[PDB]
Amino acid sequence: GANDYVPSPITINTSTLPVVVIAHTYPRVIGELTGTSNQYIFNGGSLIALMRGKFTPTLPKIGKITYNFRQGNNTQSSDFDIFDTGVPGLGIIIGMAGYWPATPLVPINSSSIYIDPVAANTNPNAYNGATGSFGARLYVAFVATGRLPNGYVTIPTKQLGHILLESNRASLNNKRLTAPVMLNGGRIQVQSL
């Protein structure tokens, strides 16, 4: 059908965090995961649409930290909300972007934000150019929020939040399609020298 768009998750992997080699300074970023992308977070309708994605984080917000991702193309630091993994001492920060690399990494630092097009954060009538899918890039860094013991620690799989699909086509907008944004759990290692 014209509006038969379907959601798919976008996921990033804890297992790509390098060994954390250690400072008693909190908060601090202790490494970046490998960024991921999904071109087809929303896909399937037969009629092209102007679309945008609104991201809402749903983990507890501990506080803020200034950071500049080594990945992405931002040249200055921004404020990021630190979200709780649930594991003591460990939080994460999030950036998201449109699928295509020219679009900017958008720091997640408010209760909800448009990740693409970023213009929609100040223009409520702005959408992506018409096409048959909506995708995104996902970036995550781990944050030490307190003292970390030496050795391995397990991070559970966490749902970081969801993307809501919006459109200027009412029938599509009204479906309120949502896609999960996931942190795949895994093992990290701390080496305290």
b (16+ CB within 10 A) / e for 106-143: bbbbeeebbbbbbebeeeeeebbeeeebbbbbbbbbbb
99 sits near ligand FUL (criterion: CB under 6 A): yes
Q: The dihedral of CA 22, 23, 24, 26: what is its sign?
A: negative
b (16+ CB within 10 A) / e for 144-153: bbeebeeeeb
Among 110, 112, 123, 131, binds ligand FUL (CB under 6 A): 131
Minimum CB distance to ligand FUL, residue 128 (Å): 5
Q: In this complex, which beta carbon is closest to ligand FUL, that of residue 137 or of residue 158?
A: 137
Q: Residue 34 corresponds to which tokens in the numbers above?
A: 């490998």
Among 14, 78, 109, 128, binds ligand FUL (CB under 6 A): 128
11 binds, among Cl ion, ligand FUL, none (CB under 5 to 8 A by kind): Cl ion
Among 135, 158, 181, 183, binds ligand FUL (CB under 6 A): 135
For residue 189, the surrounding DSSP H or E stretch is strand 186-191
Beta-bridge partner residues of 10: 181
Instruction: Report the interface residues with ligand FUL, using CB under 6 A.
Output: 39, 98-99, 128, 131, 133-135
Which residues are annotated binding-site positions for alpha-D-galactose?
39, 100, 135
- Site residues (CB under 5 A) for Cl ion? 10-11, 13, 34, 38-39, 68-69, 74, 105, 158-159, 169-170
Positions at the binding site? 39, 100, 135
